[PDB]
Amino acid sequence: DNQFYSVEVGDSTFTVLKRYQNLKPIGSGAQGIVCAAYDAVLDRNVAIKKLSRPFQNQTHAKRAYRELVLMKCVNHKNIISLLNVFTPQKTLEEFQDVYLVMELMDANLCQVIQMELDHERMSYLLYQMLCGIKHLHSAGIIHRDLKPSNIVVKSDCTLKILDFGLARTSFMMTPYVVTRYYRAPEVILGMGYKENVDIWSVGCIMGEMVRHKILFPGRDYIDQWNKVIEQLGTPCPEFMKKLQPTVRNYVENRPKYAGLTFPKLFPDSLFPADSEHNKLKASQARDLLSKMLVIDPAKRISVDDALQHPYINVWYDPAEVEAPPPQIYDKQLDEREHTIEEWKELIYKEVMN
């Protein structure tokens, strides 16, 4: 007898606890392979993510460790939570893989982006990204890495945020390019950041939901900055005052743009606007977009003010907005350094307890 069985999914061997049957590959993004499965114990479908040798490098290890600790201690309906965690291997030396069991969602935002949402759904989705984000922030976690693939949705329009973003700290042998499209200027230009760095990302997603195309589709940070300033224009003088002379020199010496206006960037043809209701919602949609998509974060709308916005406020709920902050025991979580052997032991201790 063993508690586990093994089966192929694409070119991966899933070795899972017998309670999980009928594995369907629902995707293979960044962290590994993810399967849908039926869980005979709880009598429901779940998602199962396989981490292969998470401790193989310092990025995979810090992200995998961080993911485990946070997925345990945060309890909010807009952030995926762990149903179960396991490893098939019996001891620390044999130890290879970690399996994360999460509640199953129906899709991510990349798929929603290709649909035309009514205002009521779009406002709701966005309200839930806000509550998810506020919660993280109320516990010292700034994401800095929201994108459509890290945000999953249900058919009844419920939404959860998949991962916990970047830490406060690196090279990788991968075929997978990283997405920078949703990165805030203060991250791009490297000038330091605060809470509302995440609201640049939300504004990028929201703009994409409307226009059905990526707002700022650059191949590198240079090409990215170019696309930012074509659309929104060259930022004003007082923003430039905040850039280090090295980067400031570069920024200052780029071709200038007055930039497009929000009605021009986002015509009424893109929003439902047949009824008066829709007409009014559409102007409130642009109003908010014009406050999230501000380059100078001294002049960008904050999380709470966005929750306060008329387009959003429809759904406001204190139970959801001011849920008690998650308690994190690790406390050196964001900035800890270890070798790969030390990571293996930390991860293993986490999977085991």
Contact 48, 38 (CB under 8 A): no
Among 39, 97, 145, 198, the active-site one is 145
**Specified resolution (Å):** 2.4
Question: How far is it, in rounded angstroms, from Cα 294 to Cα 308?
Answer: 18
Q: How far apart are CA 239 and CA 241, in angstroms?
A: 5
| Burial readout 178-202 (b: 16 or more C-beta within 10 A, e: otherwise) | eebbbbbbbbbbebebebbbbbbbb
CB atoms within 10 A of CB 47: 21
Look up residue 351 and give its two tokens: 């999977």
First-residue to last-residue Cα distance in the chain = 24
What is the residue extent of each domain of the chain?
4-106, 107-323
* Separation CA 197–CA 186 (nearest Å): 8
Q: Tokens for 9?
A: 């999914």
3-class secondary structure, 120: helix
Which fold does the domain 4-106 belong to in CATH?
Phosphorylase Kinase; domain 1 (3.30.200)
Do residues 299 and 192 lie in contact, with contact meaning Cβ atoms separated by under 8 Å? no
For residue 227 the two structure tokens come to 């696309």
Does the annotation count 220 as an active-site position?
A: no
**Residue holding tokens 């930012």?**
228
Q: Which residue has the tokens 């949402």?
A: 117
DSSP summary character for residue 26 = E
Can you give the three-state secondary structure of 84-108, one letter per residue?
EEECCCCCCCCCCCEEEEEECCCEE
Task: Name the token pair of 39.
Answer: 């869980």
Provide the experimental method for this PDB entry. Answer: X-ray
Pick out the residues of the known binding site for ATP.
26-34, 49
| Backbone gaps in the chain, preceding residues (C–N over 2.5 A) | 169
**Which residue type does 56 have?**
Q
Inter-axis angle of helices 58-73 and 340-352, nearest 10: 20
If we measure between CA atoms, which residue out of 314, 295, 129 comes closest to residue 206? 129
Binding-site residues from annotation: 26-34, 49
CATH code reported for the domain at 107-323 = 1.10.510.10
Helix (H, G, I), strand (E, B) or coil at 21: strand
228/13 Cα distance (integer angstroms) = 43
